[PDB]
Amino acid sequence: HHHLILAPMVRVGTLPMRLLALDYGADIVYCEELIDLKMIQCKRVVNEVLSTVDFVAPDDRVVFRTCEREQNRVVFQMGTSDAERALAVARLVENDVAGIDVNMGCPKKGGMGAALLSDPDKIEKILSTLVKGTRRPVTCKIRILPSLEDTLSLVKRIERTGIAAIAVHGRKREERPQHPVSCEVIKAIADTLSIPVIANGGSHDHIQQYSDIEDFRQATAASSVMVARAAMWNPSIFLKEGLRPLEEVMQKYIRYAVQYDNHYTNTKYCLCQMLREQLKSPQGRLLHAAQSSREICEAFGLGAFYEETTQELDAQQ
Ligand SMILES: Cc1cc2nc3c(=O)[nH]c(=O)nc-3n(C[C@H](O)[C@H](O)[C@H](O)COP(=O)(O)O)c2cc1C
Ligand SMILES: [Cl-]
Numbered sequence: 274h275h276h277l278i279l280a281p282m283v284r285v286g287t288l289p290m291r292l293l294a295l296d297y298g299a300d301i302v303y304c305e306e307l308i309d310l311k312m313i314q315c316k317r318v319v320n321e322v323l324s325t326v327d328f329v330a331p332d333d334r335v336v337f338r339t340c341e342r343e344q345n346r347v348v349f350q351m352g353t354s355d356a357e358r359a360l361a362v363a364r365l366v367e368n369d370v371a372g373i374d375v376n377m378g379c380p381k382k383g384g385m386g387a388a389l390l391s392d393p394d395k396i397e398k399i400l401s402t403l404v405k406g407t408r409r410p411v412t413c414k415i416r417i418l419p420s421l422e423d424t425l426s427l428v429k430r431i432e433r434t435g436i437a438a439i440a441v442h443g444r445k446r447e448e449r450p451q452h453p454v455s456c457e458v459i460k461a462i463a464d465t466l467s468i469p470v471i472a473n474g475g476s477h478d479h480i481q482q483y484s485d486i487e488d489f490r491q492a493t494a495a496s497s498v499m500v501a502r503a504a505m506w507n508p509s510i511f512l513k514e515g516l517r518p519l520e521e522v523m524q525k526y527i528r529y530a531v532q533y534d535n536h537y538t539n540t541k542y543c544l545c546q547m548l549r550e551q552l553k554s555p556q557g558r559l560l561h562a563a564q565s566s567r568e569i570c571e572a573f574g575l576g577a578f579y580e581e582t583t584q585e586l587d588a589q590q
């Protein structure tokens with residue numbers, strides 16, 4: 274079968290969402306973009322209390338948190354503009370992740386994401402250094418260029434570095450979500466290359482249900498599909514049997530958020546992204562007023578679950 278991939282998403286792509294996407298059928302889960310300049314300052318810490326592997330910064334902040342459940346399916350995405358810094362980050366996390374990715378599509382310090390697309394010499398140096406320096410499969414996620422000839426020249430050069438696969442968001446650096454995705458440009462890339470092409474940019478316009486994923490993969494002639502917004506809205510998008518009610522989904526998300534001591538502002542943010550219109554509901558208002566993880570659980574009838582879980586984690590700490 275073809276792969277269902279959770280696209281890298283800043284704030285959204287923390288451990289609870291990654292595990293929840295795996296539960297609903299995602300084959301591969303990408304973590305949020307993490308900046309090389311922050312990751313190079315981190316220490317690998319085994320967390321016995323949570324059964325996690327943490328990457329802790331000198332200010333005691335956990336930058337990246339992973340667990341054995343996602344070890345063979347998690348792809349680490351880094352933000353970098355430097356080959357040596359990229360390799361130093363790859364060497365830090367390689368034993369705990371299944372793959373290493375470089376962000377080359379972010380329009381949002383500079384020199385990273387979409388800014389890299391105008392510097393193919395730097396892309397070449399970063400990717401070749403990573404491929405030779407890690408035993409893990411190396412990938413990159415890109416945006417398309419103003420010209421198809423220039424887009425094709427770039428992907429051919431990227432392929433020559435020895436990367437495992439390329440994720441193509443069929444939008445130009447300047448194009449916003451309202452602009453349609455270019456299926457034909459992903460198809461032109463998929464036809465041209467020998468390596469797997471991961472199609473991306475189909476949420477809402479093409480992907481609203483599970484069956485839409487294979488339709489998008491067929492439209493772009495891609496090896497697999499990477500989903501961002503549709504999974505952010507409802508992680509049960511990956512489930513073959515159909516969408517689960519958001520009530521059900523939010524329950525499972527909060528349980529993981531508590532079990533893996535997720536920061537309450539991050540739990541709140543991800544729930545707000547799922548709710549959207551449902552934020553105006555009494556529950557959405559209680560979520561908005563919530564100032565702790567306990568208060569989030571209270572808004573969702575998980576106060577007892579919170580108490581039992583945190584007391585069991587306080588005992589082993
Ligand atoms: C909340 C959010 C955060 C994003 N953060 C990242 C990121 O960390 N890395 C990345 O390469 N793309 C990032 N993206 C872009 C998505 O990965 C994706 O390319 C884009 O949303 C198009 O796919 P979609 O139509 O399935 O949403 C972000 C998108 C969203 C919605
Ligand atoms: Cl992007």
Ligand SMILES: [Cl-]
Nearest residue numbers: 565566567568
């Ligand atoms: Cl409290």
